Design a protein around this ligand. Sequence first.
Ligand SMILES: O=C(CCc1cccc2ccccc12)NO
Ligand SMILES: O=C(CCc1cccc2ccccc12)NO
Ligand SMILES: [Zn+2]
Ligand SMILES: [Zn+2]
Ligand SMILES: [Zn+2]
Lengths: 206, 206, 206, 205
Amino acid sequence: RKVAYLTFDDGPGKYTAELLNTLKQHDAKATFFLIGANVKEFPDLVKRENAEGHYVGMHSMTHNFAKLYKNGEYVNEMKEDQGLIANIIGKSPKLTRPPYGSMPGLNEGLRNKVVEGGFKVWDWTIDSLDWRYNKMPVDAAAAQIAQNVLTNATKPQEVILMHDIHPQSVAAVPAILKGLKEKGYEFEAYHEESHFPVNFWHDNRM
Amino acid sequence: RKVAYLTFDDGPGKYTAELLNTLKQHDAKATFFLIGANVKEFPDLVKRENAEGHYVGMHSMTHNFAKLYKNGEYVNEMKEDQGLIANIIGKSPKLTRPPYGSMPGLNEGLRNKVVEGGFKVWDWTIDSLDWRYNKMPVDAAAAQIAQNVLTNATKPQEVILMHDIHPQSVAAVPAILKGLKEKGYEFEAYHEESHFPVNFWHDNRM
Amino acid sequence: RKVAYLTFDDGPGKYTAELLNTLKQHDAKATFFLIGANVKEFPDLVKRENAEGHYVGMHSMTHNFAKLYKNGEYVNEMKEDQGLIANIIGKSPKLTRPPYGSMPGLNEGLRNKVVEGGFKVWDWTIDSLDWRYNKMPVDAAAAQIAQNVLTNATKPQEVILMHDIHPQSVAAVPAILKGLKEKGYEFEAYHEESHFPVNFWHDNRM
Amino acid sequence: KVAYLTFDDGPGKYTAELLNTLKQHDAKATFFLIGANVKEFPDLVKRENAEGHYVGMHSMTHNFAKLYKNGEYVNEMKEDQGLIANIIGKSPKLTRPPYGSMPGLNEGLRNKVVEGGFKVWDWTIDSLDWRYNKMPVDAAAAQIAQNVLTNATKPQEVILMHDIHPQSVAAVPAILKGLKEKGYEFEAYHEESHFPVNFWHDNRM
Ligand SMILES: O=C(CCc1cccc2ccccc12)NO
Ligand SMILES: O=C(CCc1cccc2ccccc12)NO
Ligand SMILES: [Zn+2]
Ligand SMILES: [Zn+2]
Ligand SMILES: [Zn+2]
């Protein structure tokens, strides 16, 4: 009954098709949260992520904490990012991934608008922390990121946070896919039909 | 000597007295981490919890992630929570349970102050996931949260995150005491002279 | 004959005395570059580092890049640090260690002043990256920190950058000391009479 | 076993002496030349290629803040490549970072480098020749020899030297003997022979 939900934030990026191939090679599916500015620059990768069986959901437009939460543009940005992604793949996805996490930015006010605007919100239960291993050999950054993700996968479902916009991150997904498989995980994308809440506010409305 | 430590967060609340009855009926001991305003409004339940063999520790004042961790008031909030509890049970308890868990908001500095102020910090090994089942039919939700807890019970020691302010959680406290004892577990409160560490940072000074 | 110079920057601090005991236990000598604000808060611990056979060097007053290098108060601040260290250990050390390293803050002018004042300057040849591991279980951070130092210790002399003001750092020194001397390293302090240059500028007057 | 001697920050006064020493031991080497020194020593540049050595770049300003923190690296290697092309008539691709690629060649700049056509090479052995600047050249040289011979253990080896230093040039003779005794060949870098040697293990480079 073990599923691992690989998420990748802030893409699409220059290492993303590499990553897209490695997933194909293990016939493993995953989830992609996209900044609109990269939707616009890498549109072929958007519809390609979708065309290979991956969930394409929204990160924001600005990835700016002050505008997203202090000024409350979160839902506005998700909706705009939604349109872009739709114009490419013909879906209006509903899952959002908050920049810097829902905690503490998504306050009860904003979470109300999320719930009223049809949207879902996903945080995560493992934080690979991949984006911090920017100052080392890349192969060794992959391995310490693989150790991180491997050694925390213990719950029946696990939502793994990475960013496909860093070489060290994609370089680690080989070891990650091999290790979790040995630990008994299947690699599936987020299906809207089978939604269950994963946020820090413990809010099962989203 | 399997020992199972039942933990109940964010109370006391309206279903707490029902829980206290169910525990005594199975001569079961548990641990309650209380919020300060619930202590100001339910002094009787607090006095009762201690009276029937339960450890009574703290869960802070505001349960507000910004104030505790980003503004560094955690220890200040656990201190005023301890006085409020000291004014009813005549002990000053040491064990704290961080809202939203130790990781990552309990940074290296706060953990100095926690060690300096006398406190221990305790997380869990089992997330009942009772919050997913909010405001759904209580029996079905309950049998479901039991499945969550029953299934992940596997090592000699376990600490289980539950909330006694939610009905589906308390409703499933019978079905948990059933199978957990079946598997050979005894149900004790946290004893301060028996302190071992259970925290996500693996910081053993707490 | 290989020797590894463990250096510990930004101290003394709250984990220093434990560091001082793990050093003491494996008959291992090391080097400490201190900040003057912590020379004044923890004078016993400088006294002690010295009294146990460790080099005690300066690492400035403010640790402020703008003030050190743009405003050129580097030599001013390492002389002030010198002063305080001496009043405690009764000797004026000459080696300094630049906040954020010599490159590129210590321009040719300041390098001339450094020489003109009798001071030497040390950077390093291995950067443990210890302080970047502040968001994980400490046991796990120490092991990656150790992996970092071990897999880069390859030359006859190595000068290993660490900070004794972070728990994950002092936690790694045990495994570092066991691995390096398995590799054939001895753990000596910087001896003032035996100075050989280690700077990013390749300047051998320092 | 093959041993790739590299020399930085030239050409210089002793480059011509070093080129003779190489010619006589039938040795080939690799040269990372600073822009202002190719503007001053065109004949040395032209001679280095002519006698069977690789000639790569080492930038325009050899300035850490400009290259890495202000992101001018690729720009000043392209310019440096231009100047070198105006002598040897081909545009070399291999670069050697001033102060190495770690940690100044961040992920954004390593993308520019792969994009711009360039490779990056670091080293395996640091001769530490700069330690012995301005001391008795005979002895200073003998010791830099010791350093590298001491560390020659691997099948392929890339050695950082500097031909702007008397000490370093003086001891190329001993290094050539010790290394060819240990069974090493002495080849220059070539662009289809390229395998990655960079502190980041970025194998795009
Ligand atoms: O949005 C994200 C953020 C992850 C994240 C979590 C917590 C702190 C962070 C600080 C800087 C950058 C990302 C952070 N991933 O795409
Ligand atoms: O101040 C210091 C240097 C600290 C430091 C640690 C880790 C990486 C660094 C990279 C560049 C500059 C300084 C760094 N030691 O106290
Ligand atoms: Zn993001
Ligand atoms: Zn809580
Ligand atoms: Zn150079």
